[PDB]
Paper text:
Rab proteins, the biggest subfamily within the superfamily of small GTPases, are major regulators of vesicular trafficking in eukaryotic cells. In this publication, we present a thorough biochemical and structural analysis of a Rab effector domain termed bivalent Mical/EHBP Rab binding (bMERB) domain. The results show that the domains probably constitute a Rab8-effector family involved in endosomal trafficking, and the Rab-binding specificity can be well explained from the 3-dimensional structures of complexes determined in this work.
Well diffracting crystals were found using the RBD of Mical-cL (residues 534–683) in complex with different Rab proteins (Rab1, Rab8 and Rab10). Most interactions were visible between the Rab proteins and α-helix 3 of Mical-cL with some additional contributing residues from α-helix 2, forming extensive contacts involving residues within switch I and II of the Rab proteins. Whereas we observed KD values of 2.2–5.2 µM for Rab1 binding to the bMERB domains of Mical proteins and no detectable binding of Rab1 to the bMERB domains of EHBPs, we detected strong binding and ca. 100 nanomolar affinities for Rab8 and the different bMERB domains. Besides the specificity of bMERB domains towards the Rab8 family, another interesting observation was made in the ITC experiments comparing the stoichiometry of binding of Rab8 and the different RBDs: Whereas Rab8 bound in a 1:1 stoichiometry to Mical-cL and EHBP1, a 2:1 stoichiometry binding was observed for Mical-1, Mical-3 and EHBP1L1. Interestingly, whereas Rab1 contains a glutamate near the N-terminus (Glu4), all Rab8 family members contain one or (in the case of Rab10) two lysine residues in this region that point towards a negatively charged patch in Mical-cL. The sequence of the N-terminal residues of each Rab protein is shown below the corresponding structure: Whereas Rab1 contains a negatively charged glutamate at position 4, Rab8 and Rab10 contain one or two lysine residues at position 3 or at position 3 and 4, respectively.
Author numbering:
A (entry chain A): 3 to 176
B (entry chain B): 533 to 572, 582 to 681
The structure:
Amino acid sequence: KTYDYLFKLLLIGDSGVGKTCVLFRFSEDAFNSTFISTIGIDFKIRTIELDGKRIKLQIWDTAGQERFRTITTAYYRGAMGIMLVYDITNEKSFDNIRNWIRNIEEHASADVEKMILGNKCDVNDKRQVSKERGEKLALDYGIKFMETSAKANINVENAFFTLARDIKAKMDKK
Amino acid sequence: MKQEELKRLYKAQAIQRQLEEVEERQRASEIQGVRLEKALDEAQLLQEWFKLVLEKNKLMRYESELLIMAQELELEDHQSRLEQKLREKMLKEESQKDEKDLNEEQEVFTELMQVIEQRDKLVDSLEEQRIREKAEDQHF
Ligand SMILES: Nc1nc2c(ncn2[C@@H]2O[C@H](COP(=O)(O)OP(=O)(O)NP(=O)(O)O)[C@@H](O)[C@H]2O)c(=O)[nH]1
Ligand SMILES: [Mg+2]
């Protein structure tokens, strides 16, 4: 009804980095410390109005665990935006972003937009990846990066808004 | 008691409330339809009947839409059930799983994924409605 067009987005990243909680706060304004790992894949809707335009966000939430990596790969192709999520409190998550990008190249069609977020920045205390590291990596790929916190509602909005527009600009400009 | 499936049920009920309003005015619109059909200043009333055709159209768009929203929530519920059932099955160790347990665990995983599939099919068909509305309403 309300939506001019809808975009399919995808959240990928090692298990536990908070993809589900990120999607939860974006769509619901809420958070739950309880850890319940995504089984297979899920998706949620949020319609937004940027540029005077309402766009229906169909956001797919992949399971981080290798068990389902198989299945999650199936949904890379239709994706029109993808967000690679790593955990500031875990560096190994940060290093697997390369593995995720390889996955993107094997399954997502090259035109895909891309964005990287380091989440759980609400507490620096156990930070093991400096924010500077993350940004220079993103710039190495050229794609936009941001730190976020689903616990504190920091940049979740911001992030989804900007990837949503970049796909807009790219597709209407075409 | 339940927890924030609540939202799903209140919303389902609201959807059927406005559904109810809608086929209410579908009945009314249809009856004025056959009244003015019986009629055929006449120019003015033709303008009015034109308004009513527009109205039937708008009502159909809203109605088919509401029907989808309804089945969306039904699927979301079914998904919730299926998911928590699979997890309870997954807590037992693989060593303790026999063929019945393994296979039905299996079975609920696939039913689950298929339910997700149909959710998306509703998103897509909802979209074909959006684009057709754009396309024929382009003349308007
Ligand atoms: N402090 C903090 N904790 C967070 C944040 N986001 C998620 N968490 C916590 O970190 C854990 C990860 O949750 P989850 O969203 O399921 O991560 P995930 O990447 O979806 N896991 P999986 O990929 O297996 O489904 C949870 O215990 C959650 O409460 C955040 O922004 N800040
Ligand atoms: Mg998850």
